Amino acid sequence: MDIKIIKDKKNPLLNRRELDFIVKYEGSTPSRNDVRNKLAAMLNAPLELLVIQRIKTEYGMQESKGYAKLYEDADRMKQVEQEYVLKRNAVPGSETEGEEA
């Protein structure tokens, strides 16, 4: 298929990279893996570090778009994805301190 690098956003905070592009083809739709390998090859970056948010195929437009996430390290990708693993949904404890003697 054909890929077009729309824009490349940087994020040193999360340690990732928001890259946008458009996938074009003439027949059977491409596989996220195919696109990934393509991008990884395009950005000469690692696949493991390269991730795809979600591809969206148009209607009889022979074109699919999908945002990818390029990371500098996997260690980060883990911790980053480990941030949404610590969420609450209930009142916390309380508070109290003091002694004597």
Side-chain angles (χ1 to χ4, degrees):
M1 63 281 178
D2 252 20
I3 302 177
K4 71 189 73 208
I5 303 140
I6 293 270
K7 265 220 134 107
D8 156 40
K9 162 148 156 262
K10 220 220 137 187
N11 183 316
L13 309 179
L14 313 166
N15 225 131
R16 74 184 181 197
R17 229 153 106 174
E18 304 276 40
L19 318 118
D20 210 16
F21 65 105
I22 304 288
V23 195
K24 267 164 166 251
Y25 49 101
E26 264 158 56
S28 334
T29 281
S31 304
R32 281 147 105 183
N33 260 280
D34 248 322
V35 168
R36 249 207 231 159
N37 258 308
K38 203 139 195 109
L39 234 100
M42 279 152 59
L43 341 190
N44 316 266
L47 220 103
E48 45 234 65
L49 301 191
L50 228 111
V51 204
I52 312 273
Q53 180 160 267
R54 213 110 154 291
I55 281 175
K56 217 147 209 259
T57 312
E58 274 299 294
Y59 275 109
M61 299 231 303
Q62 306 321 99
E63 174 245 280
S64 296
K65 95 176 263 87
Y67 279 84
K69 292 166 290 226
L70 166 49
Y71 285 77
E72 283 214 75
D73 287 323
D75 221 7
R76 250 299 197 162
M77 166 148 79
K78 306 212 265 206
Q79 266 205 119
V80 179
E81 231 291 274
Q82 204 229 36
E83 309 234 293
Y84 234 84
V85 185
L86 57 137
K87 59 156 225 238
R88 201 142 296 194
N89 314 280
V91 84
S94 183
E95 208 194 310
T96 162
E97 251 217 287
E99 219 186 61
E100 228 198 75

